[model samples]
Target chain A: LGWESLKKLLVFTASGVKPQGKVAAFDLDGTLITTRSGKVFPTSPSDWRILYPEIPKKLQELAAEGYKLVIFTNQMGIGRGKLPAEVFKGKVEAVLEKLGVPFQVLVATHAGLNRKPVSGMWDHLQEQANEGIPISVEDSVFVGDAAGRLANWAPGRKKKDFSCADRLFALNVGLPFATPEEFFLKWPAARFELPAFDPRTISSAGPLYLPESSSLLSPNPEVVVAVGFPGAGKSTFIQEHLVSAGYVHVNRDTLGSWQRCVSSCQAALRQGKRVVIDNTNPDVPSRARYIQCAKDAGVPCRCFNFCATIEQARHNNRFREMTDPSHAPVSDMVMFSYRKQFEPPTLAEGFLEILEIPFRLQEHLDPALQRLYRQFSEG
Target chain B: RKSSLGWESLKKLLVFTASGVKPQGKVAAFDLDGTLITTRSGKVFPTSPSDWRILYPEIPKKLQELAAEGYKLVIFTNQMGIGRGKLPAEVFKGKVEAVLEKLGVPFQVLVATHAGLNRKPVSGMWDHLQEQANEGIPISVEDSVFVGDAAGRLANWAPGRKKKDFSCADRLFALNVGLPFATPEEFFLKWPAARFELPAFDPRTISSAGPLYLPESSSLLSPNPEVVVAVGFPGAGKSTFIQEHLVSAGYVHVNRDTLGSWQRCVSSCQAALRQGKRVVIDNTNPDVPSRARYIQCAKDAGVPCRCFNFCATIEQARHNNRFREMTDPSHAPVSDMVMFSYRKQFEPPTLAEGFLEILEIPFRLQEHLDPALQRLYRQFSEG
Candidate 1:
């Protein structure tokens, strides 16, 4: 993608739904590109160039301006059997190839509100909006066409014109805009114009951990881990690698018994010390308390996700002695029980830097098996 | 025994001698700093007596609660600066009376010097109180409680923690071996890797003693050696000062105002001397009337009586701050009558009186003790 097309792509990405420093969703199809002759081209490279001239430049620019981009569109040709499903899938794959930024979308081919103009897409975006990211009717700005206005899409489907839907999007955003060009000219544009970047205001007072300021901290402190799920093996990794390395083990069970744990963790952070937390902290809200403490104490937080292989964990657990000082024995019960409550911590949770350890596995013993086991067990 | 907020192993001597009573009753001793006020600010208040206004808002209510429970509250404190000429005993006493008048509660005040046995973290205050109020009777030292925040704060910071019997080594061992350390820093750095080990505090662990080193009551004076004196009236915050002051100096306390039962005065006095223990007495001992019991008890026990008088004029006492005593019966006559009493009836002590020995007195009275009035009149006669 050349700079010009990249600019159009940037506009398309930037024009998507972004509500108060959060949720930036995009409407695919005509919003991102003008489809020629009703031909539904899946987001492929050839189709992208055929659709819009400024797609690449716009998407790249918007990405650089720090807007999360996702393509939310409707593809009814597949539902009507007028187009092959594989062809649409291939086009979508091609679009992924052409874009350097993270582009995602929620698509629907049915006569539903999510199809466009109907606001189902907005509802879906609302459901997935991050914590502390304001979703006020004033903060949310939507972009859609006729396909988004139908009944099969949401609880209340309103019959509205494309421009009316655009008006509705503008009304919801607390900002006025009509054409895709207008949105691109406004939002990410304004974000780029700001002289100073305040990560705190953007992420609900998130901690800014500059390595240079670590010297101001106090002597010894405690660490609180904001994690997502127990299956993440945060406890095992922290126990084996983190805790034995000289950190007090703190978790729900341990915390319930120790009041000093939180204060100690705070003190450690203030004192410029290292503290390790072993928890599957997926939900950022739960992590907000710890993050607030770290920020208030002006301490840096380091997060480690145990994205290690299950086989590696299993092998390590098999050979690891339960009483060993360096390692905490990982049992099936421990892993299953912990993973059961996994809630991921978010940037909005106020962490200085949240390092997410993606799940790594040898494929066979991965969480896919665990997910399958959980579903089966629940059933 | 009264609990000293959360001070470890430091029990309080609640027993004390009340004024005008045939037998002294329970006197809950209090320290001014640490035990009464908070060093939570990391330092003592700026003013001599006004700094006590920082007492927790609920403190006066708590003291009232204890008073209603029949406690004869007394403040036992040592003003080492008095020995350094930073404060005057009369001024300190005035501040104490002002606090009592503001708090609307009745209590006794006693200030100990830095040197004599009655000085803070020492049992001299206990000895004095026992002798004056108990009328030479023995009281239960174990029953009395001492309350202070940093009764032995300076001593605690002393290089070896050796101001008294329990050296820094003993304190260190206690912290290391105990379930949890009580020091402020220890609350955070409990693990060895997190905290640096101070020198072992195991020199000899001398237990707490009451006035005159009595065995019955385990006062904190012998143990801590830096007592807190909670001055002022009911709302004067004698309790609050003892609670917060001198936290870093590593002091200990006995209890709040609950254990000041005058019934156990003699036993308390006997426990004062005999070394290595520090305690605080919380009371409203003003002039010779209030201090008489404490002085007599200290003399009998061979311990010195330290005095710290809260200095405040009646005009300044009207501002009800901290634990102010607004309607205390003792201060009902107000400032005019109090000043008159001072000028006429209140006979200042002379060296010939020999009531009790003062340790590290606040001012040098030897020069002022002579009949200076006679000299003034002689100059007038010559003219």
Candidate 2:
């Protein structure tokens, strides 16, 4: 099991045969071998096993047929400090030895430009590392287990492929791709969920979110109370729209309580400042103090009614918890409490205006966030 | 209201006060680019005022009809090229004057020179228009409508038309102002280009199937001797999650990125495991094959291994990375390429990976994503 390694690239050639143009790329783990035990991976480099009885024979046949047999595997262990590079070297030598065929191995030892799913390794193979063998993408084929599919790709198939790297690797390099079962056992291609997401496909030139309306904020200093259930994007709205527009953001969460928020609002208004109170002012009673403060300060008070539904608020709550773990998780009970006390602002509430803030994607936001909000929006 | 008109002091916005006509309760808003006019010079952007012509001869005619119907014609143009200093501010001023003079009607023109209050979708200029320039006129949302070309959609508008609009800011501007929106082709030519697709994150369409937060997992480590493989993108909160929840509670932290290589980290893990110390490998084990080495090592050492899967998305990771670059001067800059690379290779953790148990690291929104702050942080990396 002693296999020599190259910096980030490890090359193994059977019989020291010169590299050829016709290539047959294969993934090492699920495509090559299933562990002899119930373990997720092989217990040892010598934990001898083959995926199919005919695998070695077929690879030998392909090698004899003048196809360059190559194995492209992503091994992050060398980077994560999980698997020693020397140990990995031994494992590759042992596995290829058992196959009883000449093979070339390329292991992406860390997260780098040469990693799989990225075209670095394949580009290197074709452009430089292949010993002047001019490989045609149209003539090459790749087989791996990470062809992301749903559980029911077949009548008996239950577990989905863990990732779609092998499939994408071929796609990125314009090569034909197949699962190990399809390539080795001649299994027919089955329907599968293509990778649900690809960051490579995103564009940064355009806006990610869309607003529902373009109502301008009031010019005069005002007490702007945001009314919505917990996780209704009120805080985000204030931060993005109001704070930048010269409105001072007064949050109950930041001030520690609604009473303190009211005091802050009064203080800000007394200083002739425009203030926006960002909170789940769910009821008329909760909103009254702010309105009274605006009145005392001789400023008009407006109500920003966040029209996000219960489902939308809950989704946003979860989104907040995941993206910012330090923030307290908003429990469903708390959301329900807001819903119970929720009172739609009426003209009788003594507001100069009640702005309806419907959900709108702020396109300038992170594209991933834009996608999430678009998917989770309460349309 | 007249005293509030500080248009002369506004640095980035070029303002034109309506003259020879009184204000109306209804406002008709228009976006400049690909709306009222496009570059006649066959260029992507107009190099000067003379490089542009009306998109259609019917533009002035339509605005006249709207002005005749008691609507105040206002132009809100975003000239980012000026903000970027690629184009002169005077060019936009000259273009607006020429266009309005051709219309031969009283109009108010506001040009956003930078990414500020004057920018489209921010509603800052609209506020100025209504509060300072409207002269006590009250506008009704139902009576107002905005026309622009930046309706978000799949790139091609028709079979032969392949060029996509640059943004959805104009349409969003209309939406934010609670006004009906129409594309230039729709408003001026009576030809709806096509049903436009919404932006990626349209608030009206956001919905979720289940809770997004990662829930608490069943305690599996039990302070016993075990190998823990932390899996996620570079800024996926793995180290922070492990440091706060596991390391502080006595698990040995083995990080390859910080330790420089996995060889050192694995040696540390082995050393700790030999001493019966709990080990946490805070590296992005993107796939089963990547996780195999640690599991095999743990198996060899007669200690079971588990996975701490950080369920971070590319968006969250990018957000996290941007935050780190902004706050920590010593942190090495990570590119979008690295994040995408991780995403492209990411394999969700499964119990089949020889895990005694799989722990989920949920996403948490940390910073309020401010465009200005983002720009400030991004500017440093641009060099």
Candidate 3:
């Protein structure tokens, strides 16, 4: 067994394997094999059986035809610390042994890009493990169980798919996809709902912000608190219009604390520099601190609240973690907390004007990045 | 909306539209200095702002005819003198208005004030016309033609010529925009076809396919954790190459655009090496200093660094820029100033820069581009 673990993936290659330009891939638990105890998930490493009688022969025929057999499994529990790595590795080793054919096992161990549907795992399989030869995406087919199928997909199955991750994974990598039922049991295609957001349906139009006619800039010194809860976003307007125009950026993230941001705002105000207090000032008190800072500085205060739904934020957050190479993800806990305390900025909370910045597309956006944004990053 | 009698500025251009100039399918684009207007003193350069008049008596009548025939008359001129402080902006503004008033026909003057894509021989001004200034109407390239004085004509092809046309930029600009080219003599004075010299660099004639990297035997992946510095101009397919080859093959990408600074990128490179990761520095490491920072970091971490030189010339890069402007309108346009600056500072990256290897990446076209995109690329978007 040739097994190596990277930062995000766990790859295992059998000694008898032959590298090929064509790859026949599968999902681990449901498509190739299932639990012997008849439970959806295996209770232990040993408690599983071959899912279908047709799987082994189909796989063997692929191997004879010089197809590299690969199984891409999403095991979030091992990396999340719910299950042991050695335990999961032991189960995969035993499972690969049972296939009775040389195969490679690629276990996606995390919840980021390497996870199913993001194509990071497949990206590795083709680029790193294909022995420097190009893999034919046209000839490859990925079989998985988590294809977005409705419940009662068959007479025996009573539950819907856990997620549409596997199907979407195939789409992301430009590979044709099939479920265990379809590829193994030879069933007809069933009805399924694709992810709500599809790049195909969205146009690359310009962004829109609220208080349409209101000025975003000031002739004199002023304090503007711009808020967007999820950190992964652009400041193109602020950077181009305000920052380049001599406005001081007082970001809490940059300053390390809100109190520091307040002091920084006061510092800029003392020097007669306009300030944009940039952060997720969720509640009334959070915004009040900046308003009071403006009040003391004898400057009018304004609020540029970025109004986007939590789902949008989550989608954006996940989308960034996938597309942006060095970007970090937003935790569900922080998003939930922000949603609970989130108060929409209003004219009542300020001395001057209140403009809500609606999160919309930019005029000159990265087409690849925009396309990434419109696609589903998670199931 | 129809063209209004006023001036406006966009990106790197100063724009003026004559009253009644409507957005039309066909365009009668002409260069300003010698094509449509010339110095009344009969000198190469204008002595003063007011010392200018229509180049030919047929100008007003010809332009009026074109304007009446459903064509938008446009003046695309490069006035670097204004940007360089040789001429005042107000003086030129007044001159444009005076010229427009006397021409007795509707016209839109699109002026490039600095050295960038908007400058002649680059198609950024034309792009702005269709993308922004055209009121959402697409200018049919087939029906459009640019007439300029600098048609790369040789000196004394006709009798008693003192010098060749100042530069072939007028010819190149028309060629780049996929428009019919014409000299002022041919276009206005009704002369026969004339000879001109072509530049050594041909922006046209891209290979149908080619090798992605030089030293065809070079291994794509390193056997050890290494720093692979990308040396390429922006839009030279560096990012896409890294994304497909190195980054996909388990290399950590460290780019300045994402990291904010090269210092941050170098630090990230060092840290990733400490954690035993293959790192790809995805930036235009044009010169030694820009590339050496990561090379030093690699040495500190006891890892080797390689330079992936992306050899996309100025012309090809400009072509890529215009191609992106057409297909990906949302993609921010890179200026020619930055590209020429890169070329100026670009010391050829070599093994002398303390790299384990130097791989030359030829400008291989990503053929996956749609046919429309391919056609755009094939067009003379660059000189």
Candidate 4:
């Protein structure tokens, strides 16, 4: 078997393939080969051939000119248990042989950084598979049928591609892209659109709290309880403003119970320490424990209400998933749980003051992360 | 003899009596600025010493009638501007004389120069009157009245008024000593009464009897050398409780304040426990770490640790502080910040924190404590 299978990826190199400096890559399924029976999707391992009549010689001439031909394909069906692994392996070997040129194929077998639109697969080929030779990004080219083209870019059987995955993948690795119709048939370039939430656009966090005139640090020791949901920016705000300033931090996520949180907060207070209780604190009874603790301690309690909306939380989640590699998790049910459980905090609950913290982001974030953050990934 | 200038001072309180004035059982007391007088410029506050006039045409006649009816006329006014330097002392002295001459009767004046004991709500000046003045005569509250502008009533208690009374001090002051209270509107113009707002911390609501703590069933003495940590606001009777109970039973005293460090306190606690003495921590061990350190010490000594959590509210703690101040005049005042600091760092005690049990020490009247001190404690010491 020429193909090798490993975690999250499958890489195959046919017998005559040689790793070289000048690389030319193409997406396998629609760009290079199609079914011999003309089905949009394959029916069997034997039912396939090169897609374009002009494709074989075009690739042979590029190989003679020292271009290393590579095919990158997304084969999620293998990992998802729907597609047969050996059957797909046999099909790749049969197709590469029919192309009449040496070739290497990299298959992203699961959803991860190696998936299309992410640069991991390309990065692996450049850093690991290139036989210690540097590949010039400017000198390389990628051809794929999914060039983010609008609907009807081709004749009858054509509509717009389902996703811009191939185009974005090439863009991420700094390679020029062409549709099979454009690259193989010598047609002109077509128009395309990018994601709305562009990570390139930097975000701005306004005043730490509303009413700019309010105090961030309490003059006296206080129990500052937060009222917010997960990913509502409570952790960041509490971390930067209070924890850094020597206020003891009590988070329910870390302690795992509201009972422990109240006890920890009270313990910290008895240590004569200023404290910030970091939790969603969605309801009155949930917050009452903290307020009562403050009274028990003989200090005042304050409420910090996060003003981020649920839609914003989802947007923030997708943005972090794309930007912050090891970011916190998100679930629709948890956010909904927070919403249903939340009761707006008030002075009637014994809070000496109530501060509404807004959802503003950061430029202190990495440049690529900032760019991805600006992109609309939730949609 | 009283100074010919017709005034004398005791601490921050200034006093004056017109030439023929004398103490009487039926005393008629009045607040000076808004009750009996108003600024001639019609401003709420007097702009100058002479920027003054009697409040109404009926004022002088009414005072003369009270004087003729064998009632002693007296004035209690908070002239804070004098103490704060906004008003000159001698200039205010002259204003008092002028207002007295206009009233055409000998009226006594008592001025609270600044805040604190003599402040209207504290009953300091009234106590001085019963003890130092009144010619040894017992003044009857039923036969006396106090009228001031700050009646603690809302704005528009009278016609053409958009602003409430400046404060409820005059009403609070009357209540401080059980004197019949009337706003200037109600007294001078015979207007009907307005509602009164009591302060948030009322001394009358303090209970005079109960167990010192929720776990009153526990014995003060341990069978073995062990640790007992205090969790409370400063001056919440921790020292008193420890001294009367633990110390009397030969428990070792360990205080962070006295040693200037918890480190030293902890070392000393271990030292005493090593020496086979019972240990009681005196500082407000407000949180778990504070109690935990003692627990660690006790564990090392093979003794059981207990938490003595004082449940005194800031109000009660403050009352305790003032009582100490009143009884021992030279004793250092415990700043409210210390109380605030405890609440800032306090953790309610729990058995989970390695405690055998957490004793909830609620506020209680010490029956054996000086009755005079308890009497002072029973009164609102501050507003």
Candidate 5:
């Protein structure tokens, strides 16, 4: 065999293999199973576990490939009187039956020098496979733990030495170990199905809240407008929480086209999308625009405004980012710096609900989180 | 067909199975001081009369069951105090004989201070007991059991804990092979944050006979450097030398007490190598198999193989031991091939094998090991 063929055989033996044959020989003891040192063989019927989980499936594949397999063994317990001969034979037969394989002949060594290293067992297998029908030795191979007889027959195929790799090759050709997704990614031809992931799977993990006026395309809904001065991560939370949860997050700074704004947002709501209007929405026009859209779509809209003391806003402005378009410029800190100029929306502002979910106390947030608001204000 | 390690492997395995049997009948052994009496505390319990209270409730009951089973209760305890100038030997013996009489347990042997291989955790105590119970005495390592509590639990029962500095280094070596342990109390002790478990401490019974199924290399906990080399090919008679020198001080020998059971042997050597324990492997290792296992185990442990070239001729191996068996023709091909293959790779130990110290045990140095080698030899001889 060429080097490539030898490497293929090595890989197959390391994992699985395919053999072309009608007759097969299986090794007992270490190959078929093992008995750990100092530990006794199981005398009870319940103890015989399957040696390899993949062996049965591999056997079926080999049979499909037109191969017949049989187990050959050497038991020295009878010679030492440690275990009875009949029980030893019974264990092997029972294991084979459980594995769903029937043997044509069960050969024993005490009868003659036909055990491993003698080559007699291999010779006997050829005769047995040819009983009524003709069998060819060229297509036959012996799979065993001991290479005694096979070693004697080097440079020939009469006593072929086979391994676990030979059986694996008969199952699937060149199917390496890879995750199903990875396999499908490389070999698109093998892709068959896509698994299902539903809302119940998501809901089971935890409930996700959304703004009531975002859109109907969204599943569940609840909303909170982050009411802190600039640099508080309000816009970041708006994009991540509202959008990822199927809400239409609106950043007024991104309102480059007002004509498309309300109509597009209302269309999303009619389709059940969760939406959020994130802006200084601090004044009348910004709040009024989203309110009109909510009314047109028959949904609710909540507006949050900056309500920080002038001294704190001035102190915090230094750390707030002003360069990013998505972010509010800290110079906007002047808006909160003067409260008299600020339009604090009252009952007549057309808000059906009015609650100061403010810069200090938040009803929805935990104690540990409320402390974070204090920290942001101090910073 | 691999002609090597076939039926020969099979036969070796079977022999191991047979040797594992810890005969039958009660082989009760015990701890001397704490479980039987408190001494270090100056709280002396009368040894001549059964005044000492059995510590745990389970122990007295456990001992009674073994007595009903007709075990020859023997207490092989360490009274190093007698040797150390603290206590009288008669007083120690009196306390032990009193407890045996009170329990109505027939005292087979109250082995107090016979300092040799006959010590707790060591095989000598069990060896002497077996010899005493030799003729149809129904003795076996399997049927036999050892139980110790408290300081004794830490003393005689803990197999992997080294005597001076108790470390898990020895225990890990035998973790792969089944190490016999009885209880969690035997295994664990409450410390600050972590709970430390001692190795194989039993409080129910004490047995020297196949006591706790010790893993290989247990004999050479410490090896003394000076010893004779019994050389051979695989399956040649290296085991007899290992068994003989095992209890001898200043010499540590490695051989499968039972062939093909290299798990225990490998574990012991690997552990000893890690502990800087000197060892001599007694296998037909020839050059190749020897170097491979030694180099791998030593390198993994960050120690040296300490190869000692005996320079014994193949002609010497022929008559080195009468126990050497003739090779089977079936194994001849693989054997000869392995031997030839070994020749190409075998190199005498230099800085590479990582020997901590290498003093050639020349055929002449065989008579007397130098001081450094002699010190290593003496520890085991005393052990």
Candidate 6:
């Protein structure tokens, strides 16, 4: 293997490689070798050695056992221009020379989906390998060094794995994963914090119920004050339920501030239209202005208090951050503030009625998303 | 490979087969603008279906080959104008259908009308497509390829192409999914893509690094009493930095955001200076004139002034404002328009302003942040 041979910018398999149904993929750098040779990073094409003496033997054994050994490495060094592409190619060729086995190399040259944890490199491998022979994900396994774990995964250890990208890569690809220590040294896998939210678990479990109403309130002209922490799904809930009922949403985010929101609500009421104040009105002071506006218009003001737990809001927040480009996730400080200032809505606050909006997974939501929301609710 | 997997959130999916989870095991995903289609109508976004034409006829032909080769063809687009109410959803739907009709293939389309996980580069849409829409068959990461035009390269990929891409989202999206990536020109025209570079900033790397970037340099403020003019976007952490390092050091804070008037702000700065007090003007003194008033106040008080530039990106500023609005009742949420206005009016502080020192204040949230919050900050800083 040389720079010219691997220069096509495609997945590079070892010369004259044949397809094997099962793959034992491993991450490079910390998994296979490190710059423990008295340098922070590898200095040259051959300025590296194996992580553990056993790594080469294990890899060769896996290849012999009918598993097509492959390395999925995120070489940010190339992207950062610290290591030239040719140099990286040279380094890989040297590593292969030492291993003396038929293996494939998938190098994520830059920070793209192909990088670890994103699942792009794996996608590329399955596409170009074995002349388009489909590889079973179940039969494949991934090993990497970026497992997220405590600094002390064992007694007398220093810092934990730099990141959980390796673990997440396995999770995302639906492949069984083991750390280098676990795979090579037979140590038990250490525990680490997975992402707080996974979109796949969101679901519409059932219709959410509102606190018992004296009667189904008329969708006619009225003011609806929504109270919840940021990411409590207040805007979404209103868009789903109240928007079709002729409710005009007056959001602080759009209007720029609560005073403007109050003005917009008043403006809508004067137009003989129903209004929804979509904001985190966690205290009596924040809710008072909207209630007063409704009173001035002689229309009923109802408060729909979102009862999503703190954990649920955080989960929902992460979902929003991942999915919503325009939305920035609500910070923990903001969540803490809302929790601190939250005063459960009462009729004493001059609401015509107070309604409890229990969190429910939306109907037809993804099972993964469903699981996330359900777990947050349970917590 | 099928089960009773009825449907996921069709509301987010917008238009697609509800239960079609047809994972082809291989995918050829393409981006919308500058890749599959470009507007000939001279509008940034097409107003009508006829305003658009395919980028290259080879697109349809190549797409047909991939689909026939057991690849699921998917289109992931970011139509932010729809969410902003600049373009009607019905119009975008019509345009998308028209383009698909021209291609004449079985295809799945996912439009991120609003900012959400579904948007490009976020990998939310890809995840949804793979996990829920692809039936039970998993799409092999090895088998899928994403092609887009937004490969962040230097200006001039070919004759008459002088500007770099508007963003590198498409490239990053492909990277995020670990997919084999090619620029549309490379895939369609076989034009070797001009050498491209990684994003100057990456949110993922920043988030995992830690909450702050505390430069090794110490405080640039002078030990002698002087006025410090803070300049940056609103919610740029000026107030927090001032309160922590300056106020405790005995500098009285005078901000127009709190004072409500520039006149009051100038008067208060003059009062503080006359009283032999150190003052920091914590306002977004966007331009030379707006900043001149404070410089004059310092001049009148015989006090030298320094400029502290809160170097948070627009994304970070918006993120900061969102956090402030949710948490602090006293904080007036700054709108995106306001930030845009400030950008237009902003004049980078120069030595001509007679500043004693100019400090670049990168965003640093006050304390150890929740990982999620840190992630948000990182995204804001980069995006």
How well does candidate 2 score on lDDT at residue A239? 73
Best by TM-score: 4
Model 6's alpha-carbon lDDT is 0.72
DockQ of 3: 0.00
Local accuracy of candidate 5 as per-residue lDDT tens digits, A1-379: 1011110011001112223345555655544555534244655533555555666665566566676565555444554466565565566556666666544433443322243332334445445333454444556444433322233243343643332222221111111222211222232222121112111111112212233343323344322233444443356455554666666654433332444455546545654565665545455554577677767767665554444445444433422321111112355434454343445665465555544422223344456433222321110
DockQ comparison, 1 vs 3, better candidate: 1
User: How is the predicted docking of candidate 4 categorized under the CAPRI scheme?
Assistant: incorrect
The 10 consecutive residues of candidate 3 chain B with the worst lDDT sum are B200-209
DockQ for candidate 4: 0.00
- Say which docking band candidate 6 falls in: incorrect
Worst ten in a row by lDDT for model 1 chain A = A2-11
Q: What DockQ does every candidate get? A: 0.01, 0.01, 0.00, 0.00, 0.01, 0.01
- Candidate 3, lDDT over the whole model: 0.77
Cα-based lDDT at residue A55, candidate 1: 57
Off by over 4 Å in 5: A1-379, B1-24, B39-52, B83-86, B101-104, B112-114, B133-136, B149-383
Per-model B-chain TM-score:
0.35, 0.65, 0.67, 0.85, 0.36, 0.67
Instruction: State residue B274's C-alpha deviation in candidate 6, in Å.
Output: 71
Position A56, candidate 4: lDDT: 95
Return the TM-score for chain B, candidate 2: 0.65
lDDT of 6 by residue, B239-316 (tens): 887887788878888988679998999889999988888899999898999998888888888888888878777766
Q: Residue-wise lDDT of candidate 2 within B160-265, one digit each (tens)? A: 7687666767766766565667777766664534545433222211112223334443773455788989888898778877787788889988888779987887
Across residues A81-164, which tens digit of lDDT does each residue of candidate 6 receive?
A: 687777677778778878788778888775435566766677677875555877888988898878888777888767766678
**Local error of candidate 1 at A22, Å?**
62
Report the CA-based lDDT of candidate 4 relative to the real structure.
Answer: 0.77
How well does candidate 1 score on lDDT at residue A115?
39
Off by over 4 Å in 3: A1-8, A14-22, A39-41, A60-67, A76-90, A109-112, A131-133, A148-160, A198-205, A208-216, A232-245, A252-270, A283-300, A315-329, A346-376, B1-383
When 3 and 6 are scored with lDDT, the better candidate is 3
Q: For each predicted model, how many residue pairs clash, with residues at least 3 apart or on different chains?
A: 242, 30, 3, 21, 61, 54
